[PDB]
Amino acid sequence: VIDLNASAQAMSDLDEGAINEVVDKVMAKADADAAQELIKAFQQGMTKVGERFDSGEYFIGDLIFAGEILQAAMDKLKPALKRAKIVLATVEGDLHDIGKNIFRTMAEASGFEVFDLGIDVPVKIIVDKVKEVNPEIVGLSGVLTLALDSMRETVDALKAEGLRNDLKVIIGGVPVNENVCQRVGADDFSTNAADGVKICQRWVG
């Protein structure tokens, strides 16, 4: 670009004018390597959206916005240019998916292939999907205590099938924290969907 750090800031600020000004400049010079640098800068800015949510400056709506804004930039940058895979579910006992879907949108916009299994998803169905597609990451959503139990059951089933050690497990949902992460047997838990993407990007290469 002219200025990658300013472009990261523009994503952080959710400034559609500035984001599209730079996307246009990059698309004009038709350099794949420059487009990839801009993408990385936008991804860094997504992380900053999460930090701004965690501070209380930004709200749920801003997280919805961020995902949609990143995806729109990615769609424009695609002409100028093997995805890591995530199997994603709201687990058995739970019908809450607003949050999971915020994450799904951010993860899709960040170049992951996401297999969204939907809500109230039985353990056995999650495990069958992991056998089928061999994802790098399994992401599990829930809030009710029964759901948190189903998270633990899903990890235990992956261990029984010899699948656990070759993937990473991330959990999210209203009540998740380090204590729930430990009880479940997950690798990490998210504070917010943008933090979760940050985690997942670190795991993949």
Author numbering: 1 to 81, 88 to 211
Provide the authors' own sentences about this structure as they appear in the paper:
CobDH was crystallized in the presence of methylcobalamin and the structure was refined to 1.5 Å resolution. Two CobDH monomers were found in the asymmetric unit. The overall high-resolution structure of CobDH reveals two domains that are separated by a flexible linker. The N-terminal domain (residues 1–82) folds into an antiparallel four-helix bundle. The C-terminal domain (residues 90–212) resembles a typical Rossmann fold with a central five-stranded parallel β-sheet surrounded by six α-helices that forms the binding site for the methylcobalamin. The corrin ring and the central Co atom are presented on the surface of the protein, while the dimethylbenzimidazole (DMB) base protrudes deep into the central β-sheet region. His102 forms a coordination bond towards the Co atom from the lower axial site, which results in a base-off/His-on cobalamin-binding form. No electron density has been observed at the upper axial ligand site from the Co atom. This finding leads to the conclusion that the methyl group in the crystals has been cleaved off by photoreduction during crystallization, cryoprotection or X-ray exposure, a process that has also been described for other crystal structures of methylcobalamin-dependent enzymes, resulting in the formation of cob(II)alamin. No electron density was observed corresponding to the long linker region which connects the two domains (residues 83–89), suggesting a high degree of flexibility within the linker.
